[PDB]
Amino acid sequence: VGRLIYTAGGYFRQSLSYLEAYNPSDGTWLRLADLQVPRSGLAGCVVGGLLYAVGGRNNSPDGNTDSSALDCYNPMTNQWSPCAPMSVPRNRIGVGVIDGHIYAVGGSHGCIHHNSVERYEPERDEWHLVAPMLTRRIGVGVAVLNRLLYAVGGFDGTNRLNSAECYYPERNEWRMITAMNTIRSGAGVCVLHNCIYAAGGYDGQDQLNSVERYDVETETWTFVAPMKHRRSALGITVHQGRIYVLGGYDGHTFLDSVECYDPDTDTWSEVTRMTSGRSGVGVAVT
Ligand SMILES: COc1ccc(S(=O)(=O)N(CC(N)=O)c2ccc(N(CC(N)=O)S(=O)(=O)c3ccc(N)cc3)c3ccccc23)cc1
């Protein structure tokens, strides 16, 4: 009884360790087991009903280090269990899942701007690297469609990117797709109805509120209704046919308003507010 939206970690004056869940049907908010380590800039995904916390940059009383950690949360036990860590720390990471395999895309290790991606086999609890991206990307958004991994926007070390690349697992290669109309760093990327949505983000001069979706059929970026709040480093997921944007940062305050986008109406609604404003959260639904 209840498929939930999960928010894990985040930042607000100090990277948080909170794990909270939102039930859209009734609007309730749930406080669950906190992360063993406060983390922000991490990404979230679910494989086999299990929630995974990947990457980010964790708080410590002995430093503020880029985390290569992979942690697994079981809603049934409300208990976090650490898994095998990634080869290298990845902060500002994008993660996409293909057949129960977790793809870690880009991310930063201090000044190192990763272009390498590694995949995780949950059953073996092992990470193995694959082909690296054509471009270095941190703050990149990752989305999987028809068993294809799309990495969009980000920062390559000197430029904020509007380009996107596509990973073909069968060929194990990266192909550059038509770039977005807008440069987006720390934007929200998700898939809905054969379309990759890029929501919000940072273009280099100001946090964005516009949203443009990429139509796989045409392979072209088209603008849709923009969001009511400008946000960057936002959490994003789709839940029962609607896109959900969680929190983010507008350039002034750490936001918490959650906005819902309806494809059929092409309108944004503020469905709820979170317990506390936060940014750089990982988001997943299960
Ligand atoms: C110091 O103030 C803070 C503002 C936000 C946070 S945060 O917790 O949200 N956070 C986590 C972390 N730092 O690891 C993040 C911060 C910035 C990001 N960008 C980098 C990129 N595009 O490469 S950004 O483009 O969104 C951007 C650029 C400039 C401004 N002014 C704001 C945002 C992130 C991208 C992805 C994930 C997390 C990000 C913490 C402190």
> Structural domain boundaries of the chain?
5-285
Experimental approach was X-ray
Question: What residues have CB less than 8 Å from 92, skipping those under 6 apart?
Answer: 41, 55, 56, 57, 106, 107, 108, 138, 139, 140, 154, 155, 186
| 109-to-55, 113, 115, 138, 224 alpha-carbon distances in Å | 10, 7, 11, 9, 34
Pocket test for ligand 1, best of 16, 57, 249, 274 (most atoms within 8 A of CB): 249
Closest CA to 185 of 130, 258, 248, 276: 248
Taking the C-alpha atoms of residue 250 and residue 230, their distance in angstroms, rounded to an integer, is 5
Picking from 237, 195, 223, the residue whose alpha carbon sits closest to that of residue 96 is 237
Which atom of ligand 1 is nearest the CA belonging to 248? Answer: 9
Resolution in angstroms for this experimental structure? Answer: 3.0
Pocket flag, ligand 1, residue 106 (CB < 6 Å): no
Q: Which two tokens stand for residue 150?
A: 């799309």
**Assigned fold of 5-285:** Neuraminidase (2.120.10)
Atom of ligand 1 nearest to the CA of 10: 8
Q: For 174-192, give one letter per residue: b (16+ CB within 10 A) or e.
A: beebeebebbbbbbbbbbb
Residues 277 and 109: their CA atoms lie apart, in Å, by 26
Residue nearest to atom 7 of ligand 1 (CA): 280
Q: Which of 7, 92, 278 to mutate to test the pocket of ligand 1 (most atoms within 8 A of CB)?
A: 92
Query: The tokens of 64 are what?
Result: 């503020």
Rounded to an integer, what distance in angstroms lies between the CA atom of residue 125 and that of residue 83? 7
Q: How far is the CA of 123 from the centre of ligand 1 (A)?
A: 33
